[PDB]
Amino acid sequence: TRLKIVTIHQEPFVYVKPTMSDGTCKEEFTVNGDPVKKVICTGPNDTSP
Ligand SMILES: *[C@@H]1O[C@H](CO)[C@@H](O)[C@H](O)[C@H]1NC(C)=O
């Protein structure tokens, strides 16, 4: 039922954005007026140092 998915930070394929207030995403529109179906991914900010 639940499948854990991993991906790498690559902008033209996986856009990664900081949240607005707390775990939420600003519903942006395309040039065709399509709201982009986003997802709440879990990632670190930078490397361990
Ligand atoms: C993540 O790192 C960037 C660069 O230092 C910083 O601007 C941002 O505030 C960090 N995220 C948080 C909320 O800790």
3-state DSSP assignment of residue 29: strand
| Method for this entry | cryo-EM
Which of 48, 30, 46 shows the shortest CA–CA distance to 38? 30
Q: Find all residues with CB under 8 Å of 16, minimum gap 6, and list them.
A: 9, 41, 43
- Ligand 1 mean position, distance from CA 31 (Å): 30
CA angle 32, 36, 41 (to 5 degrees): 165
Handedness of CA 36, 42, 45, 49 (dihedral sign): negative
**Resolution limit, Å:** 5.3
- Ligand 1 mean position, distance from CA 45 (Å): 7
Q: Find all residues with CB under 8 Å of 35, minimum gap 6, and list them.
A: 27, 28, 29
